[PDB]
Amino acid sequence: IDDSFTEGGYISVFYQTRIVVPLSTPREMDILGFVSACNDFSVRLLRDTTHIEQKA
Amino acid sequence: AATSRDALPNTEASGPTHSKEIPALTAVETGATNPLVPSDTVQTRHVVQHRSRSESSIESFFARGACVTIMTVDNPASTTNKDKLFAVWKITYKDTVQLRRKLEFFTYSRFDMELTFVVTANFTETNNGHALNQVYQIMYIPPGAPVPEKWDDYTWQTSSNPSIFYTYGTAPARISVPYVGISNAYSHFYDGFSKVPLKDQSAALGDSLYGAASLNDFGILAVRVVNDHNPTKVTSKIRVYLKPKHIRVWCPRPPRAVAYYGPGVDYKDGTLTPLSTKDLTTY
Amino acid sequence: AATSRDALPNTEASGPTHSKEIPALTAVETGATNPLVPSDTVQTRHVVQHRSRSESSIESFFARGACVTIMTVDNPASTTNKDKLFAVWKITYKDTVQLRRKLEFFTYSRFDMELTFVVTANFTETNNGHALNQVYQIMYIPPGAPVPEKWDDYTWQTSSNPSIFYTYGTAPARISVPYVGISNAYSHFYDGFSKVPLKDQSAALGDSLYGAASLNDFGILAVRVVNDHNPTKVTSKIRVYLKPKHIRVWCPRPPRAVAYYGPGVDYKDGTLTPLSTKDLTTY
Amino acid sequence: GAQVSSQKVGAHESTINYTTINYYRDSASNAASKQDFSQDPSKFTEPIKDVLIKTAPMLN
Amino acid sequence: GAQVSSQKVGAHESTINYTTINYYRDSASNAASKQDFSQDPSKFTEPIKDVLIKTAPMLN
Amino acid sequence: GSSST
Amino acid sequence: GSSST
Amino acid sequence: EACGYSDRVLQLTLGNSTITTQEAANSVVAYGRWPEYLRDSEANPVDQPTEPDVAACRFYTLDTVSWTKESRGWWWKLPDALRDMGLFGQNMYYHYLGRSGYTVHVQCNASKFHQGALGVFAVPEMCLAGDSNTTTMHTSYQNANPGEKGGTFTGTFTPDNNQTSPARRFCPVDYLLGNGTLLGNAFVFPHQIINLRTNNCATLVLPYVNSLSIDSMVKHNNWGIAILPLAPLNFASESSPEIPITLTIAPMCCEFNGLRNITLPRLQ
Amino acid sequence: NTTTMHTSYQNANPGEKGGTFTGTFTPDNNQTSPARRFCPVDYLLGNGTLLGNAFVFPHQIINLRTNNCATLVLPYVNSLSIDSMVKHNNWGIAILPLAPLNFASESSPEIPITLTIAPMCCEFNGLRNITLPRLQ
Amino acid sequence: EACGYSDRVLQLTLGNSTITTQEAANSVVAYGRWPEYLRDSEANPVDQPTEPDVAACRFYTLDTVSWTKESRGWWWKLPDALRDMGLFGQNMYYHYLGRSGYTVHVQCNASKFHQGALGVFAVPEMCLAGDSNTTTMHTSYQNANPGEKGGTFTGTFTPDNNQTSPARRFCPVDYLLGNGTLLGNAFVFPHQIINLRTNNCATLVLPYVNSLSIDSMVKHNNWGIAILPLAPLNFASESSPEIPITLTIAPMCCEFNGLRNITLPRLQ
Ligand SMILES: CCCCCCCCCCCCC/C=C\[C@H](O)[C@H](N)CO
Ligand SMILES: CCCCCCCCCCCCC/C=C\[C@H](O)[C@H](N)CO
Ligand SMILES: *C(=O)CCCCCCCCCCCCC
Numbered sequence A: 001i002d003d004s005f006t007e008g009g010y011i012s013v014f015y016q017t018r019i020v021v022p023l024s025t026p027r028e029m030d031i032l033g034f035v036s037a038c039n040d041f042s043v044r045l046l047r048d049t050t051h052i053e054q055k056a
Numbered sequence B, C: 001a002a003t004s005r006d007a008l009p010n011t012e013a014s015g016p017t018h019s020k021e022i023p024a025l026t027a028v029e030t031g032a033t034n035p036l037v038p039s040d041t042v043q044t045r046h047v048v049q050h051r052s053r054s055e056s057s058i059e060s061f062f063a064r065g066a067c068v069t070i071m072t073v074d075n076p077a078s079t080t081n082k083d084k085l086f087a088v089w090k091i092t093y094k095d096t097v098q099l100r101r102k103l104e105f106f107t108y109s110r111f112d113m114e115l116t117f118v119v120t121a122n123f124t125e126t127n128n129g130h131a132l133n134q135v136y137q138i139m140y141i142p143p144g145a146p147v148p149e150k151w152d153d154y155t156w157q158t159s160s161n162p163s164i165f166y167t168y169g170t171a172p173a174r175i176s177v178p179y180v181g182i183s184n185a186y187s188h189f190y191d192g193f194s195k196v197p198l199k200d201q202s203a204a205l206g207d208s209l210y211g212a213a214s215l216n217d218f219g220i221l222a223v224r225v226v227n228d229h230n231p232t233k234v235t236s237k238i239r240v241y242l243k244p245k246h247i248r249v250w251c252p253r254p255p256r257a258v259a260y261y262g263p264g265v266d267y268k269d270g271t272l273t274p275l276s277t278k279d280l281t282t283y
Numbered sequence D, E: 001g002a003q004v005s006s007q008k009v010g011a012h013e014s015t016i017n018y019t020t021i022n023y024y025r026d027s028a029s030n031a032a033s034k035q036d037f038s039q040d041p042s043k044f045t046e047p048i049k050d051v052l053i054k055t056a057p058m059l060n
Numbered sequence F, G: 001g002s003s004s005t
Numbered sequence H, J: 001e002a003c004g005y006s007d008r009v010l011q012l013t014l015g016n017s018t019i020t021t022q023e024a025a026n027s028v029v030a031y032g033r034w035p036e037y038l039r040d041s042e043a044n045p046v047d048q049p050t051e052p053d054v055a056a057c058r059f060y061t062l063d064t065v066s067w068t069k070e071s072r073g074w075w076w077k078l079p080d081a082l083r084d085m086g087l088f089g090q091n092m093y094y095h096y097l098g099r100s101g102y103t104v105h106v107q108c109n110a111s112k113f114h115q116g117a118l119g120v121f122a123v124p125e126m127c128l129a130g131d132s133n134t135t136t137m138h139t140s141y142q143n144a145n146p147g148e149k150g151g152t153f154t155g156t157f158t159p160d161n162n163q164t165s166p167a168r169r170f171c172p173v174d175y176l177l178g179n180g181t182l183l184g185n186a187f188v189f190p191h192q193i194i195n196l197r198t199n200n201c202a203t204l205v206l207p208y209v210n211s212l213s214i215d216s217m218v219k220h221n222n223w224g225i226a227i228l229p230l231a232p233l234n235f236a237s238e239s240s241p242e243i244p245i246t247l248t249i250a251p252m253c254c255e256f257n258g259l260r261n262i263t264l265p266r267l268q
Numbered sequence I: 001n002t003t004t005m006h007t008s009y010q011n012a013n014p015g016e017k018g019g020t021f022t023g024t025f026t027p028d029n030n031q032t033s034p035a036r037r038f039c040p041v042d043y044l045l046g047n048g049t050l051l052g053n054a055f056v057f058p059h060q061i062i063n064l065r066t067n068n069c070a071t072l073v074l075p076y077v078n079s080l081s082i083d084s085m086v087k088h089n090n091w092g093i094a095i096l097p098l099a100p101l102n103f104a105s106e107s108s109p110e111i112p113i114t115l116t117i118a119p120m121c122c123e124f125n126g127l128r129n130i131t132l133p134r135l136q
């Protein structure tokens, strides 16, 4: 959960130089991002999620 | 030989680099995830890793009783115009949402089923009469066997169906059931129909529901108060808890992201916006 | 190899002395306590010592269930204007004082936790109505999981949270829990904050409580009467007892000398005079 | 017919063990052992026909 | 998987023993053995860098 | 008799 | 089998 | 390889058919399992199976669709998309039971000046959501099964309000993968991405997957193929670019049991 | 005595000047703009426990007739192997007059006290831009 | 290599920082000497050195400059360009003495339709000429040391005629390498060329070079980085093209002697 004591810090992305294109080319484009865990990753204390509910 | 409670790999100390080896550069088009570890892109120290994945094994993830239904029964005065209520439930994990969502991280599964029954009762009329301790009969009626029409008809004899006679106020009832599927695994999702519509047959005749296989998949639980009618009415509820023991799962799936809407994968208008507003450059 | 139940050292017989050896003379400025025994300053006889320190081992000092909270719940008539009371408690040893003071002889600790639940109920209105035996649900809600808003909402399904369904009048409920800290030991004292106030950020934004680490340290216990509403209202109390099993402790501290005043080390005006009058030369 | 297995001991006060006896004929009645195995994620994380060497170009 | 330990017998009526079997996989479920160790108080009573000889002057 | 894991 | 302390 | 071999340049040959490609991004074998015939230890129907081998295990090309800036995505079901393909379709409709694996080759080339990315996902049991909020599980066999033309995804859920004569079709919303789960997570399914600057195709080898060794191909689809634009098509400064997408799919190790007269389904 | 655990980061952390003990607890009654500082009463070791027992903590006594200094070597102590130095203090140094200063027959003696402290075996993890804390 | 490895595709990792490149022209190690710590046989100050290791030997990115058709060139001095970079700068200003080597990575990408060539030169003792013809050797410490912004070259020598308040800055003429020698000969210094059709970066690994084992980093710069357009920027038929140039530099094997209070220099 959001917790200041166990906060993880900051991910950010910047332009190092710039995107350069020749003529006759789209000047805007998308990047897509992906996240995954490394082999040293683990979880514990099983709990119910808040990502689903059943009101009534 | 690697077990769920084994410690994860140690971090190995790694120093500076300047080479043609490019771990950081990859191509996700291939369908693969880049197998990197911190020592691939930063300088690391040696750490002896003690943490394990023991609590996220499939068994441990599911090793909990989840409520799947609440059955209502009563025992009225004999003088009532309304019949004595006995309950009938078609067995399923899809009447509630929590265990359903967990099972649906996967396409198929095999498990032994543990069912635990919690039973509570109360008075309803602002009377002052009492009731003696109730015994409940929880009868499993497999597809094909006669379903009770009355709280006291012949089917409650149970010569072959399994029944639990539970006494009120004792420890909650519990039984186990083997993997009982007619397939080699339970299908959490069936992209198909139970009938082929033929051209030479009418549309009605060839029709069937999308995604449904056996109409009566696992049968019914029928519950009754065995005690005869009592002057003061008591109403009871039987809460059923399902735990999947000795479980195996196949083919991972993205979890349910919008509210469940029936036993299928259908969704309702107005529930389709799970995500909240957050600005691209705001932490 | 010396165990807690071993006998303490024998007194050795010692006779008169006249030497340059000066055990009695010391210097406490060094920070040390003079390791003397009676034979250092008086004449002794030989005694075979049988006494042991078995009951003051850390384990034995703590080997008792202490009450840490009393949770109140009820089950009213369905016709009530006020909602059915279910209880919500943030787990802690700091709502009561006795176990707290014992744990606070030390700065840090590790232990497995044994929780025992004593449950009592009574009638409140001077009625003559009855109530059938109650079943209680004690749900552990770890930090992050959905907290119940109503006695009967979806969260009580508990597919993943641990729940105890307790039947009234049976033996008090009991479960064990492992050392669950996110640190290598529990901190009885944390001289710090959970946030750094930055200059470039407002004061409000950088602020946090002194001595508090994770806001929701261990989560919540939520308790309810599972039985439906009953004409006669019954009120119940759940008393929670905590025993630290398999315990280790580090860094000794002077015990709490003035009354506790909140979860921190704060003290209230008017409680700061523990000691009583006694004359210097009066026995 | 007793099964004796070791516990992974977390907080401490040799190997500490525990005993299990099955009371029923049907394996369905048995408790869960929790003695489970792990596997490599590869069938999901690297499903590619040609083995990936992470220091090498993924595309050559 | 039975553990057999001796009792320290206080009031009397050989070694009298008692038996313990763990019924659960998790060591957290276990009772306390009370088979505990003692240690010397020195880290608190003599935390000084140079070893103290009690017959000698503490300061020289 | 006894199995041991 | 049996341990003995 | 020092003798020229590349991850990007492949040749696939099945039966009398060959596919070549010079811009691949390797190829995927779903769950690391290559297609296989049913083993005697796992067998279930006892009659001698029909195994058509090269007559059906060959590359069939479906109708080409078109990718534009307004495309929300496409879907197909297997074996349904192949039900009318030569002797595979014949062997399917003549038998009660059938099982099959597949090589799926999605084709889409453009130019070094175009951009866009197609996520190509193979989903086991790809159950899609219906168009109704009055009835669940009501998509008709005919609408569930488009054959080779497939279906499409939409960016908007729009409920069928005609209760007298309901449409009875799917309403598959793209960011919900047409089934109520978020598309960003579809990558846990066997997949490749056709990102135009990198590659012009996707190749997925699919094993037969089911909770049974063999089943009704006519009643049940084992796999779903979902193609969605993860990054939209774009070219130079044209407002309306178009490039084609072609699917070629080969059955693999297919066997059939329970021979009788041919099934003649109601498909419209 | 209106709010517990309310000492601000700025007042909890004086830097090198330190803080002082008082013989008298005196509650901050300004509720509009609270002081938000400690009120550490000396015989209660500033934390509600009796000073005579503070000797269970690592200590030395500077008794002027005997010695002119105290030297304490402190290990890193924490419930963690490493932590936020900026959010959390590991050790506290408390200096209290157990026997008051006195000289000849002067009514107002003074002698200085100087602290010199050396970090030992210090290591740091998680390098980024510099933290700029709000200290006033 | 048959497993894909290339002269053009590199990854450099120092501390918590990684640089990747897919269009390199190999990399240069000045005079064939990799950076090293000071050896006991060559040591001189006797006090225990401070060696900050990953805290300072990591990639620091300086402010990005812009290359246009009118650009005459840029220059930086080391360690001066890094004087305000994290714990490297701190360790520098707290100690009398310091020595360091560097990995210099100059970054500049464009497109297959742009052209131009940057000469990237690492010069030991890069003494630059002053703006005056009334006084020699009069460039002030402040102007000699721009920090990370660097300085620039000019195509024209223009003498500071204000004798009342002299500018006291360099006037580095490009074809004279800013020091009175011809630029065409600057290739005897360790260098690479960023020729846009070929590569998008230059990488120079610099050893500590000096007539001493260790020296005042604050008084003396060991290396100068000079970037000059050997062939001017050009693109399609645009009259005013621009592409950015970014410098990222990492100290290597740096050690410091003579710890005291921090130096607070007059920099303006
Ligand atoms: C006296 C009480 C006896 C209770 C007997 C219950 C027997 C029926 C077991 C039902 C198994 C349900 C398994 C869950 C659902 C399936 O996964 C999916 N719908 C796919 O087949
Ligand atoms: C069904 C009932 C489950 C009960 C589960 C309780 C789990 C939470 C355990 C809480 C551990 C509390 C330990 C005591 C306090 C800590 O020492 C200090 N505040 C420092 O961290
Ligand atoms: C293997 O089990 C041989 C040893 C027997 C140990 C004692 C068994 C304890 C009681 C089990 C009763 C039977 C369960 C139906």
Ligand SMILES: *C(=O)CCCCCCCCCCCCC
Residues within 6 Å of the ligand: D002, D004, D019, D020, D021, E001, E002, E021, E022, E023, E024, F002, G001, G002
């Ligand atoms: C080691 O334990 C082997 C000897 C077994 C002695 C009898 C065990 C008594 C019953 C224990 C039942 C299992 C507890 C889950």
